[PDB]
Ligand binder design. Structure first.
Ligand code: NAD
Ligand code: NAD
Ligand code: NAD
Ligand code: NAD
Ligand code: CS
Ligand code: CS
Ligand code: CS
Ligand code: CS
Lengths: 334, 336, 336, 334
């Protein structure tokens, strides 16, 4: 069993904790680090607006939180430099605060005693970026020590894009992600550096930028320069879809697009990318463990222009992709 | 004054009523026909979850509703063959029931005394389909008698597509509309012919089909065969955006796409199509009177592939387009 | 195994189906009757906006639905006189259509071969109405044949009211329930017999009436004449709270009110009524199996006037109460 | 015309501005003070998620915002001490930041050159607190210089309570306000000093405390000690109802309760308190200018226990009550 630390016990952090509890047999979260008091953290762990109640007893004191009788050490450094991950024999830290997406900052955890850092976001200066199922075979146990698991949207787009680009080739593509609102947005109209994200999230369609389509190039260099996109944030609390419109030189039909996905979506890669012909709506992919759920009912073709749609639970889907990556790191040389 | 009748006093029927109150100097609604009772009709007219309170006194009795002193005669024939439009001198009927979009059925209003029918929706077997500002000059006041005002989505897409096709030529295009939930969706999971629209509308992203991308070809025949799309229904009560991605042979930038819309978005056409550089979200286009509000901020270009996005108030924008069309009709012949 | 039939495979029907899968070792649903087609029925069973995906394979044909290998025969008689419950050895019918809450009609299931009917709602002319944990010991397996499980709100209010009336005596009480929107409300402003439930449910606070406060008197006759109330429907898809304000002759504090609930909320009764000191919001009681979750944090006292508040999942909590009741019935006679 | 300053150009501030534009013939907002840049403020003024677009042209530069051609000076002191209200001949400042509800702080505006301060919230240390229509006749032009307009909920409850207590007498009462979510709440589950307000506001019924019922005693001292309550925040963006259950010694019916309200709700007091028999839902009282809209359809009576319900637009209703107060202050000795 490899012992894991979380820095940042927020949505993604608490998601990751639950995912380990629900899904892993060989990782154990033994310590976490957060600014806030333990009563607050343990309350948010116990009760979740999206995931429901944790199915286990939660206790806390000032040093720790105990879940189903397993004691978690909780620290509260704003500066990872002050941590001691080595005290708990922690091999992997999940960096999920959002204030260490720069790897030059994040590697403080290595200094502070960890052997690996996985940043739960697009990163700068990292050793490598992965989308599990797409380019994880290029993981280098020796040289890849501070990595990124990319973004939720990238974990949706990249798998679908790989299959279609491998089978037909993508010349150019433009994405709209119709996306659940997220914590960066406001509840009521209020100042924000992005004047659209300033507007009441739960009553508005809110357009906003995203790097997620250009970031595909990080895990699929053959697509560099070829994809771009934006997001429409809408009033659901989780659950998103990525709508990609692309040109191919191939001559293709709705049927051949769909068969390529169904063909690819099997075995291990089938845990990242699913193929569906069901009458899906967003609540049906809430708590879905795939990074990308391809909706074959939505595929359109006009000449050499193709529109495909994949779903993702931007919280849980992403988290399960990150946990898959974490299992790889844990299964190899530390 | 030209006298107007409305058949089907629902979202669009009551939108249209209010638009006439607010926006028209020469039309008057004098009769309405609807299946339900006048207590209900007048409560829903007075109080509206989207448009708010009518600014007028509303009273009812057994066969009329009176709005700001003006008596509106109210009928309740489920079959329009039983209506007497001539008894009130109704020139134009707005057919907004959703059940008479076949013009072969809708013509029952003409037999019933009306001179013109405008179907508030995509129609079949109609004389003509219009998107005001796009092809209304082809309106033939002799031969165009039962006409369609097309769909909300088409009244968004077409003004935009016309301009850009005129300027750069569109080879192929695929559309997604991110659309407010509509009254045919279910509040709780419940049977529907469309097993996705069966799902609780206010907590789901709900994919559905739309004809709008094809139906553009009725009003811009140059685009027949070139557009397809679908809709995503999302939890806002009104307001929608049309996202079109397309190919051109021209060499284009964001700047050149945006400049073409801006140069076109003026005079009378500018009341159909707006050009905006504002930081818009859906609530900002609620109760906007344009059919299409082009968001210059969302234009993207990759190679010869363009993404453009236009907003519309699928209720009030559509209604204001339909009223433009009605005003045109009411400004010409009206024989027989 | 006792064999169960469900008449009306809607929110409650499918809740009940799932509760039996999840929670019962001795009941089995073997037949269901519903007006709509099996493609729809099985899609709505498999995928649920509230409960999520059924954890089982679902297949259908023209007269059955098969769930995890187990074939469920499906009928579609709008009139229960046409059903043959005996053909499948159904002992107990769950009547969850909403259209047969008159026991004089509901008894049509008994004639059709069933030995017992449980109406998932307030009923008329019924043998007996129960809130499990409150008065189910008065269940008479000879003479209680068509029975009601009362309303979601009553299954929240009664366990609480019993305890406090037993301990301090309730003189008078008025209730407000802040309640999730339900399937009979309209998504968009649209005709409804109740002109407030006509209004778009997901963007309004909608006042409506409820019998729950009076109907408590069926199961706690000591409270007849003493309670009234109304509901506020609010934009959450499930989860509700009952806010009761009442007078006692006892001298009470917050501490003493709360201690009475806590001492009562144990053993079997504790699975009906929970006592909580947690910082609860509605999403925390979604899929809670209790009929009533007393929130100790919301208790207020002024003079001899007490305010108490209890949460309930108007879908799953009610269903789990109804299943408790069904298990009781299935544990006794079942003649004829 | 009396010239007005706003400190805090937030929801309530921008509401107040609009209200002056829409409703007053003798007040002019000539200056405002806020931390944020003018592009951001002018964007939020122009476009509102609840009130819709301002019906006038809005321009800005670094010193000002111009609305329909009228230039508003905009400052950006976090410390009112640094303002100069006297430069613009500003007589009344509306204190709507939320960081000067202590009058000992708020009177900095008097030092900084104003003659009157109206705090748009429950206040401490104020000269007086008013609910317009209830106790505004006790306003003292000479000695009441830093005042409070109370809370939205108090502006709903107090008028109804006065009429019922005057006509029947209230011994004791307990309130539930079913209230729109507000900007103090979170969009996604996140730390908050109130662990219920920590939870995703637009998918939850959220119980929370309020002083609004005890504060009635400030404007109706006869009710001191007699009322208390709490709030249930629900997923609407504005619009609220106050549900008051009370004991009276009188013997009373639904009909006599309702007739007392209808009797009182006339003339000037009728602009604060309305009487309605319509089939109201919350969207029907959005943008309603009354402080309290009594719903006679909801009145219940059991023995000597009474339940009444009044609606309020917690933003606009409150603001129009505050504007009424401001007109009183402006109409008297400065
Ligand atoms: N849809 C999603 O929620 C989503 C999807 C993909 C990626 N992500 C990414 O995951 C990351 C985390 O996002 P989130 O939604 O969980 O955020 P969050 O705000 O919910 O969680 C942040 C947590 O970090 C803690 N924290 C902040 N600074 C700290 C510090 N210096 N030291 C220790 N603890 C600190 C806070 O107390 C809080 O508990 C972000 O980079 C985000 O982009 C989120
Ligand atoms: N976003 C939109 O809401 C939108 C946009 C564009 C077009 N439309 C179209 O407008 C039309 C009307 O839709 P709506 O949204 O107002 O629907 P609605 O259901 O809100 O209104 C329908 C009205 O018709 C009445 N009615 C039904 N059958 C009738 C009959 N046989 N005779 C008389 N009255 C009858 C009903 O009582 C009701 O008042 C439809 O064709 C719809 O597609 C709607
Ligand atoms: N919160 C709740 O949803 C709630 C709580 C307590 C009690 N109930 C009660 O449960 C009952 C069912 O309500 P629901 O919410 O499941 O409603 P629903 O409308 O979701 O389900 C009704 C089902 O009955 C079917 N049906 C209708 N008429 C029929 C007929 N004549 N024969 C056969 N099938 C028929 C419909 O096709 C549908 O599948 C009602 O009495 C309701 O008051 C509901
Ligand atoms: N439902 C309601 O919205 C409601 C109802 C009744 C009362 N109120 C009260 O009104 C007050 C304001 O609330 P709001 O909802 O408008 O808040 P808000 O957060 O929307 O507005 C606050 C504004 O103040 C500005 N600001 C903050 N500190 C400042 C400083 N030191 N100097 C200058 N500007 C500063 C901010 O930039 C922001 O623009 C609060 O006391 C609130 O309780 C609100
Ligand atoms: Cs901590
Ligand atoms: Cs003609
Ligand atoms: Cs029997
Ligand atoms: Cs400023």
């Amino acid at each position: 069993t490899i012992r894991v630390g979380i820095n940042g016990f927020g949505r993604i952090g608490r998601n990751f904790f639950r995912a380990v509890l629900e899904r892993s047999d060989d990782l154990e979260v033994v310590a976490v680090n957060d600014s806030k008091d333990n009563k607050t953290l343990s309350t948010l762990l116990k009760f979740d607006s999206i995931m429901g109640r944790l199915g286990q007893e939660v206790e806390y004191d000032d040093d720790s939180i105990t879940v189903g009788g397993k004691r978690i050490a909780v620290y509260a450094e704003r500066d990872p430099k002050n941590l001691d991950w080595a005290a708990h024999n922690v091999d992997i830290v999940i960096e999920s605060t959002g204030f260490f997406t720069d790897a030059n900052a994040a590697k403080a955890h290595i200094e502070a005693g960890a052997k690996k850092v996985i940043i739960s976001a697009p990163a700068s200066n990292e050793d490598a970026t992965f989308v599990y199922g797409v380019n994880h075979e290029s993981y280098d146990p020796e040289n890849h020590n501070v990595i990124s698991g990319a973004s939720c949207t990238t974990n949706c787009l990249a798998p679908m894009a790989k299959v279609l680009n491998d089978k037909f080739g993508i010349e150019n593509g433009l994405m709209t992600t119709v996306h659940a609102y997220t914590g960066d947005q406001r509840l009521h109209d209020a100042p924000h550096r992005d004047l659209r994200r300033a507007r009441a999230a739960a009553v508005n369609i809110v357009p906003t930028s995203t790097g997620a389509a250009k970031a595909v190039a990080l895990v699929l260099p053959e697509l560099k320069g070829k994809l771009d996109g934006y997001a429409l944030r809408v009033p659901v609390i989780t659950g998103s879809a990525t709508d990609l419109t692309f040109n191919t030189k191939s001559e293709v039909t709705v049927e051949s697009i769909n068969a390529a996905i169904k063909e690819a979506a099997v075995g291990e890669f089938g845990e990242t990318l699913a193929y569906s012909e069901e009458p899906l709506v967003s609540t049906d992919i809430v708590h879905d463990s795939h990074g990308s759920i391809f909706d074959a009912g939505l595929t359109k073709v006009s000449g050499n222009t193709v529109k495909v749609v994949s779903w993702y639970d931007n919280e849980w889907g992403y988290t399960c992709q990150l946990l898959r990556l974490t299992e790889l790191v844990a299964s190899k040389l530390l």
